[PDB]
């Protein structure tokens, strides 16, 4: 079964655990390029009562550094918010729990905004079919494929 965090049958506990950043996308490409603050390699999600603890690592000159964030449920079911390089809110428009998870995030900083979409997998890579389904979801949000970056060959330290 596949669900959306904003959907009725969403079971948040099933997204608990190991995850890896497979692809990142944004309508402001620089945010996810080599030294962008949003090029985050997810490692795990810990589901709590009213929040999610996210553990990522970033890379600089080939050196990895850890970083955690706490995303809190907002008043919309399926939506979370977190402060990180501005104010962010995000939902999970699609996940199948066992293989992939697709997130859509809105960042607001200095009075501006931008969209970020991420494809995460239980293993360090995903099938080309799942990657194509992710490209279609990006297109539904006005994000061009040239703004979609596959990081599956650079997500392990």
Contact 5, 12 (CB under 8 A): yes
Contact letters (x/-) for ligand CCCCCCCCO, 45-64, by CB under 6 A? x--------x----------
CA distances from 119 to 50, 61, 79, 96, 110 (A): 23, 24, 17, 12, 27
Contact letters (x/-) for ligand CCCCCCCCO, 119-148, by CB under 6 A? ------------------------------
Segment near ligand CCCCCCCCO (CB under 6 A), from 37-45, 59-67, 129-137, 140-148? Answer: 37-45
8: phi then psi, degrees, rounded to nearest 5: -65, -45
> ∠ at Cα 129 (143, 17), nearest 5°?
85
Q: Is 78 near ligand CCCCCCCCO (CB under 6 A)? A: no
- Given candidates 3, 25, 102, 103, which one binds ligand CCCCCCCCO under the rule CB under 6 A? 103
């Amino acid at each position: 079964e596949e669900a959306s965090s904003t959907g009725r049958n969403f079971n948040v506990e099933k997204i608990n655990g190991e995850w890896h950043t497979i692809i990142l996308a944004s309508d402001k490409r620089e945010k996810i390029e080599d030294n962008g603050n949003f090029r985050l390699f997810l490692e795990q999600i810990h589901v709590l009562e009213k929040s999610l603890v996210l553990k990522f690592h970033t890379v600089r000159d080939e050196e990895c550094s850890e970083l955690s964030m706490v995303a809190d449920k907002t008043e919309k079911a399926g939506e979370y918010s977190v402060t990180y390089d501005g104010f962010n809110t995000f939902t999970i428009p699609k996940t199948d729990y066992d293989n992939f998870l697709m997130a859509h995030l809105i960042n607001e900083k200095d009075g501006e905004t931008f969209q970020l979409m991420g494809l995460y997998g239980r293993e360090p890579d995903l099938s080309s079919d799942i990657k194509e389904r992710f490209a279609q979801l990006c297109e539904e949000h006005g994000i061009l494929r040239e703004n979609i970056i596959d990081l599956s060959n650079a997500n392990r330290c």
